[PDB]
Amino acid sequence: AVVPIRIVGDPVLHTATTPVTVAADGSLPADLAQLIATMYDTMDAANGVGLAANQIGCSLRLFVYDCAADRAMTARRRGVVINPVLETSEIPETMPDPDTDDEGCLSVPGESFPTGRAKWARVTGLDADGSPVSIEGTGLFARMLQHETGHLDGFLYLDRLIGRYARNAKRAVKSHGWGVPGLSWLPGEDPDPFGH
Ligand SMILES: CCCC[C@H](CN(O)C=O)C(=O)N1CCC[C@H]1c1nc2ccccc2o1
Ligand SMILES: CCCC[C@H](CN(O)C=O)C(=O)N1CCC[C@H]1c1nc2ccccc2o1
Ligand SMILES: CCCC[C@H](CN(O)C=O)C(=O)N1CCC[C@H]1c1nc2ccccc2o1
Numbered sequence: 001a002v003v004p005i006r007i008v009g010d011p012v013l014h015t016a017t018t019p020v021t022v023a024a025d026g027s028l029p030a031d032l033a034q035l036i037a038t039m040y041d042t043m044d045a046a047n048g049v050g051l052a053a054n055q056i057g058c059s060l061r062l063f064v065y066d067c068a069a070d071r072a073m074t075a076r077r078r079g080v081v082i083n084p085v086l087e088t089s090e091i092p093e094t095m096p097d098p099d100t101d102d103e104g105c106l107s108v109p110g111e112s113f114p115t116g117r118a119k120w121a122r123v124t125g126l127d128a129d130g131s132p133v134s135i136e137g138t139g140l141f142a143r144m145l146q147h148e149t150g151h152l153d154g155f156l157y158l159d160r161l162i163g164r165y166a167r168n169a170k171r172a173v174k175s176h177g178w179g180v181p182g183l184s185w186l187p188g189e190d191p192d193p194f195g196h
């Protein structure tokens with residue numbers, strides 16, 4: 001199903017998710033497939049390259065993605081990672097570049113700000129079949145991996161902003177009246193907030 005995406009201020013976005021159950025014998029929850037299907041449907045309707053479970057109000061440690069550019073050729077374009085563990089290269093503390101570092105989030109709809117990210121990242125975890133999966137890349141793909149793991153850890157990309165970028169974002173969030181609970185938008189019902 002296509003379901004609402006929670007907006008900054010919703011507690012489910014701002015606390016760490018609970019890992020997905022994996023039994024001793026390797027088995028995943030039998031009803032996980034339905035949640036995954038909803039995550040794909042919602043990501044797609046929202047014109048996303050990624051979606052974390054807590055963005056749809058589910059505090060479980062998994063994300064889906066569909067993101068082609070800069071991925072290692074060993075990585076599927078579209079997939080899911082259950083219980084992801086994130087590795088990165090050096091996360092830069094220099095001021096992000098407005099012409100290359102812009103980043104947004106469906107839980108902060110209609111906004112984007114230059115955001116510092118590691119150039120390379122890898123996520124390992126399980127796929128929907130419970131088999132180990134490892135995906136990696138640079139540029140956009142690495143940014144996506146960091147962004148989704150961020151959600152699952154209880155963070156938004158807003159939490160990474162610095163200086164003039166953080167200033168610009170703080171005012172924007174305030175002016176929307178965001179940062180309080182209970183706010184959401186519904187892809188396919190509400191207009192696409194990114195002009196997509
Ligand atoms: C946290 C979102 C709930 C995921 C759930 C997964 N699934 O297919 C069933 O397990 C789902 O899509 N559901 C659960 C009930 C029906 C559908 C659903 N939940 C909605 C919530 C709002 C709008 C439409 C909705 O459609
Ligand atoms: C770099 C990761 C951006 C993830 C974000 C979805 N999200 O919040 C997941 O957690 C997303 O797809 N966004 C946010 C802005 C619009 C859309 C988006 N960002 C893009 C970047 C390149 C190509 C298509 C893109 O579509
Ligand atoms: C340990 C929490 C995970 C359980 C459940 C997963 N689910 O329903 C989605 O499939 C969930 O997220 N729930 C169940 C009740 C409301 C929501 C939830 N759990 C939260 C935990 C913290 C903050 C907000 C939360 O919202």
Ligand code: NI
Pocket residue numbers: 104105106107147151
């Ligand atoms: Ni996001």
